[PDB]
């Protein structure tokens, strides 16, 4: 209840500030400008490196989503099983990082 009131207040304060920042020099009548990037009309070059680091981030983010409930899960009675599963998950994280490392995955954006 109070949370969405605060969210609405922050949103309306931000949109009020943005509206005043936009439309206040609009009331000025300064001039009309014609105005006729270093590249003129070149196509954006598709780079596999940026896509590769994006996908690596996504997969590591998924394994982070798997790792997230560890503080709650440490309160279980089956402590040996939980410890083994946690160590196995972080070991799989390390193994994926090492496979990306060895096969030149982290190359020229190291």
């Amino acid at each position: 209840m109070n949370l969405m009131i605060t969210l609405l207040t922050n949103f309306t304060l931000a949109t009020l500030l943005v509206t005043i920042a936009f439309w206040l020099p609009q009331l000025n009548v300064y001039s009309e400008k014609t105005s006729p990037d270093p590249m003129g009309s070149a196509r954006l070059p598709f780079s596999m490196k940026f896509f590769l680091v994006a996908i690596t981030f996504l997969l590591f983010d998924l394994e982070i989503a798997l790792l997230l409930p560890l503080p709650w899960a440490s309160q279980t009675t089956n402590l040996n099983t939980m410890l083994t599963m946690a160590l196995l998950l972080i070991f799989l994280l390390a193994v994926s990082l090492a496979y990306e490392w060895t096969q030149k995955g982290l190359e020229w954006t190291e």
């Binding site: 990037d37 590249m39 503080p71 410890l83 070991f91 990082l97």
Partner: protein, 314 residues
């Protein structure tokens, strides 16, 4: 009555941001053997007011934007996500007490990159788009280590609640058992808010080159609010203060002093070192920070079991 609490939260944030601009200018000046602004007011106390009025009466750029919708929406998101990451902060009592405030903060920080993406796409310049894509990649790549470090630190806390983080450090500071995590967290938050030596957009096009002076000021104000918020979060995580339940002003003064010292350390960092290259910081993250973060995460999972020191769930 609650709107008074909301207003007294959000208006001092903007006031502290403007005086952070003044303090950074003056501290950098005195660190570079000179003075900061001292002519506009008594010791430059009137500089943010003059600068704000000048930026709010400046001519707009009026770009040929590909999409005016996200051109509007990017500062909206930046300011809303800068202001909304303060409500679960305990000072020593949070405005919105959240059971999962830490993970709520992580969600908002992960959501913060859409402002960069939409500001890059709205501008017609392709070099601006390339700079925005590089900044987004750096930001998400440091989100990864932020998440792992926060997860490994929270194993000494026992829950995601930010108010329990005061209770955990009632005996000793959390920088004593987790100082490597503290160093890696500090560098990761420094690279998270795009600050030196990681502010690549100022080194040789920014993501908001076509934005007008007003919206540029709004973006910069959101960035400074992010800096103050991150330093307060770091102080709460690692440098917890003594909280008397009958005198909350003691905790308020103590963590205010500590967070101001941490922000001054941010400004101290920004004027000591050269900037990184893009591949150099990618190397620093994926090949230096990440393996040690994983090793320390495994260590801090397996440590409280072998010490019979599992923190209470509630």
């Amino acid at each position: 009555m609650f709107m008074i609490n909301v207003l007294t939260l959000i208006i001092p944030i903007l006031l502290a941001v403007a005086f952070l601009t003044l303090v950074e200018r003056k501290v950098l000046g005195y660190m570079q053997f000179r003075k900061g602004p001292n002519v506009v007011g008594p010791y430059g106390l009137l500089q943010p007011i003059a600068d704000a009025i000048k930026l709010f009466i400046k001519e707009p750029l009026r770009p040929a934007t590909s999409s005016i919708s996200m051109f509007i929406l990017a500062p909206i998101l930046a300011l809303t996500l800068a202001l909304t990451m303060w409500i679960p902060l305990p000072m020593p009592y949070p405005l919105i007490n959240m059971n999962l405030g830490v993970l709520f903060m992580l969600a908002m920080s992960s959501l913060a990159v859409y402002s960069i993406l939409w500001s890059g796409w709205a501008s017609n310049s392709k070099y601006a788009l390339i700079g925005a894509l590089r900044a987004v990649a750096q930001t998400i790549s440091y989100e990864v280590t932020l998440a792992i470090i926060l997860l490994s630190v929270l194993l000494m806390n026992g829950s995601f609640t930010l108010s329990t983080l005061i209770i955990t450090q009632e005996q000793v500071w959390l920088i004593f058992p987790a100082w490597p995590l503290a160093m890696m967290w500090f560098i990761s938050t420094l690279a998270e808010t795009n600050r030196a030596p990681f502010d690549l957009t100022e080194g040789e096009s920014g993501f908001n080159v076509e934005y007008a002076a007003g919206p540029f000021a709004l973006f910069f104000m959101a960035e400074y609010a992010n800096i103050i918020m991150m330093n307060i979060f770091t102080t709460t995580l690692f440098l917890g203060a003594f909280h008397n339940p009958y005198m909350p002003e003691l905790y308020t003064i103590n963590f205010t002093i500590k967070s101001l010292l941490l922000s001054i350390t941010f400004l101290w960092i920004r004027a000591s070192y050269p900037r990184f290259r893009y591949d150099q910081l990618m190397h620093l993250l994926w090949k230096n920070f990440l393996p040690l973060t994983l090793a320390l995460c495994m260590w801090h999972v397996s440590l409280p079991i072998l010490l019979s020191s599992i923190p209470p769930q509630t």
